């Protein structure tokens, strides 16, 4: 079982969850948080720019998905993320031990 | 060693920390999330309704928690947040590799 | 790859950013959040606190580990915890970069 974790610019939202809709993900969580990568946050390009480092909003989406779905989720967020421009975000990929719903007590793959 | 996560409605956040406290649960950490479950965050009933997707707010509860206590953990959580109704929480339970106690440098189960 | 995940109190945050990204870092994900520890949010309350989330090779989270733990650290209270987890898969989306690559 999969948590795949995606850091996103926020305008993109809405274009990810349909790409995963598609697919027929279970659920889906998001949050607000902020970032930078290897550009440190630059925006701007005064003298002097690239020694400094700034937090940039984001959105992170994370979905639980099995491990039979989560390349084919991987891809879809990669293909409704990229235009092509830095910042359009990563995804990490982590493993889910354990999984409960908590109105029914059904577990693992069937409660993702 | 397991971090146990848990979405669960805002109003019962009261309710499901006490009942971890009580439990005796060392630690917690909470936060703001929006997401959707299996129903794609349908709380009406007009005719056609069930095609739309929308996003809910939500608490993200998470506690790092030893092997042989984790599962008390996810059952407290449980029994303080299930009511029988939609949307009552899922448990995703991840493993963590190390854990380290900031203040005092102190590791693995003894950080917890 | 390993999530080394933080929560530190607020005020640290820049402390170990620049711990962080001088040590060579070149990505960080920072979230508001609240909680307690073993003294219950006294000098049960909720405090806040900013969880840090870098994700890194295998060669380089223990220096990670290390610099946030330097950095976070007053000797007080509520400085924090650091809980690391394992990354299986990484992908840089403009690119399309794998993994270590990735990170
Ligand atoms: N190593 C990392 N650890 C934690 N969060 C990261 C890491 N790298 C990126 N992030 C998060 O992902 C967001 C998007 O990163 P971004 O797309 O800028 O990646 P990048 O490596 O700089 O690639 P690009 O050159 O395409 O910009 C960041 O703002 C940050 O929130
Ligand atoms: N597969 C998933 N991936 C990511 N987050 C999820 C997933 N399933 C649920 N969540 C998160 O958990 C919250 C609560 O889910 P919820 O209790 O509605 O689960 P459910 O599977 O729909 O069960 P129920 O039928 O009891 O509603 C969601 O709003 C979302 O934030
Ligand atoms: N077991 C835990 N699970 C989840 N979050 C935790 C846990 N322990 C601590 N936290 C988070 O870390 C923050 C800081 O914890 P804190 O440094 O107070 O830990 P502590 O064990 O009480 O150590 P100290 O005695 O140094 O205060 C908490 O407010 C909470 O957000
Ligand atoms: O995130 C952006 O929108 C641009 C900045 C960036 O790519 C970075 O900080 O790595
Ligand atoms: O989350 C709710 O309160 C109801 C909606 C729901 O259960 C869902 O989206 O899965
Ligand atoms: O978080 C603080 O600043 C002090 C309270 C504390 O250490 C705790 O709740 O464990
Ligand atoms: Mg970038
Ligand atoms: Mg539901
Ligand atoms: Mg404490
Ligand atoms: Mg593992």
Same mark, same amino acid.
């Given at each position: 079982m999969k948590l795949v974790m995606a850091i996103i610019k926020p305008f993109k939202l809405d274009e990810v969850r349909e790409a995963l809709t598609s697919l027929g993900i279970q659920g889906l969580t998001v949050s607000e948080v902020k970032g930078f990568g290897r550009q440190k946050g630059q925006t701007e390009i005064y &003298?002097?720019?690239?020694?400094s480092v700034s937090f940039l909003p984001k959105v992170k989406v994370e979905v639980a998905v099995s491990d039979d779905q989560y390349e084919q989720v991987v891809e879809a967020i990669q293909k409704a993320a990229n235009?092509? &421009?830095?910042?359009?975000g990563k995804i990490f990929v982590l493993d889910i031990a354990q999984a409960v719903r908590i109105r029914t007590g059904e577990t693992n793959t069937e409660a993702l």
């Open positions: &003298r002097g720019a690239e020694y235009t092509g &421009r830095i910042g359009d």
